[PDB]
Design a protein around this ligand. Sequence first.
Ligand SMILES: *C(=O)[C@@H]1[C@H](NS(=O)(=O)O)CCN1C(=O)N[C@H]1CCCN(CCN)CC1
Ligand SMILES: [Cl-]
Length: 361
Amino acid sequence: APADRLKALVDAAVQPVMKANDIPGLAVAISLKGEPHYFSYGLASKEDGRRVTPETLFEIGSVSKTFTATLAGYALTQDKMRLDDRASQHWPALQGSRFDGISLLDLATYTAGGLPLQFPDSVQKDQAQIRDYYRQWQPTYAPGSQRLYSNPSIGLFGYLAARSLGQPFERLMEQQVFPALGLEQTHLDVPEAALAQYAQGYGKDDRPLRVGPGPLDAEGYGVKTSAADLLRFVDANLHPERLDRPWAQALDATHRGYYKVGDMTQGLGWEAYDWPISLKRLQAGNSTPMALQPHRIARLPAPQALEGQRLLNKTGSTNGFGAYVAFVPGRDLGLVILANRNYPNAERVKIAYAILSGLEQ
Ligand SMILES: *C(=O)[C@@H]1[C@H](NS(=O)(=O)O)CCN1C(=O)N[C@H]1CCCN(CCN)CC1
Ligand SMILES: [Cl-]
């Protein structure tokens, strides 16, 4: 009955949302009572008929930021950087720029002062262009005052964390972070040998969309991973103590809230909500206006442990993919919803919520 109920629950949560959002393929992984549960739906590729499996690689887009945050957490807990470091401390190119007055924390938590959602399309995946972009960037408002969800913000945070560790971000992820997290199906650059696992992404008119190179793509949205691996990462988050101490600490560093915007407490990468909270509030927290509009932050007097009765989540999308990860530290409950369509965050949260609610009920 338990496996049946869980399947019934996940199917009931997933299938209508897949149909409603014409999601070709969707992988759910749920960590429940110390066990992974995988539910795979539809097609990794509509064209070659490859089914989604728990090993299908999906672009997780901005969910990558939680990996980025973990690397940063590593840098932080390795004392290679501090959250209150000015950004320019970790990149000479930024000295003299406004990043002299912007903390790593600001970058991490999108409060640098209006760094946009994405790099402008003019900024290519080019060290110099990224350098030039930040050098010329000016805060729209005081750093530390407004959250404007931003790839270049946390991208730079990750980039600087990498710099603080003296290695390229991508190399640190591949050589240290992913192996530390026991992730062998998690890639910034999917190996050729794993490309068969790489789901097709689908956008408008089902145009195939796999994420192309972009500035700080690795940091912002670089990860392709399987539901199984992303759940392993969720499990690492649920149980940092299961990782070697440096990485346990790194993960812990992503479970610290720095401010609140509405119901959301912003950690490094992870965004936390009190749990339970209504689906609508969780959706609002993961809504377009939340992402696209600056929100005055309510800074916490001290970093808040993002644990216990909290839902930590991250939405992530690429043009062709829509990922959502949510976990409830205090419930040893985690779920991953990876889809090869960028379907509305609200819908991802709806699936997650239906699953979480059904697990409660
Ligand atoms: C993360 O996925 C962010 C944003 N996250 S959010 O849903 O939580 O608001 C959603 C879109 N987004 C993101 O990173 N977009 C990338 C997608 C990749 C393609 N585009 C160029 C690819 N080189 C960059 C924008
Ligand atoms: Cl970007």
